[PDB]
Design a protein around this ligand. Sequence first.
Ligand code: HEM
Length: 154
Amino acid sequence: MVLSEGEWQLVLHVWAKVEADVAGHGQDILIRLFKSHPETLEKFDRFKHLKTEAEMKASEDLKKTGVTVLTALGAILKKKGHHEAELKPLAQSHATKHKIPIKYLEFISEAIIHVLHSRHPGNFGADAQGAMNKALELFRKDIAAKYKELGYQG
Ligand code: HEM
């Protein structure tokens, strides 16, 4: 697929707002994901054991991870589709080391869209959410194809 420049614009406009507070968005998004789909918390051996949302809000490890996840996702979005190189190393560690099914990448995409919507309603109307969804679907389709070349297609 291919996003038009206008869609990339909408995606990068709201992402510039996320970048004013990367660690807070990172926490929100992972917590939203773990609440919604608790099995996804088991993939994180570092803080699998956190039982409540309050614990998750107080975990420094969870917050550092969220910043790593969002920074890598922002570097991929900023490429505007030309992300081949950024994807490689990513697809390799998630398919071979962490083993994250494509399905989980769908759950976190849902979580990202929920948080942008709650935090940025004025910059995240229908057209911008559609564009963000296209950009995340694109990312998932390219990573799934890479999983396949790597022997995982999960
Ligand atoms: C927008 C989606 C995602 C991006 C861009 C992202 C990016 C990353 C990055 C850059 C790292 C560090 C380097 C490496 O290990 O490759 C990482 C580690 C990790 N990711 Fe992902 N990730 C995404 C989704 C997920 C999801 C949905 C899960 C789990 C359900 C997940 C599980 C992990 C785990 C377990 C690690 C190790 C954390 C630690 O021990 O350091 N990731 N991810």
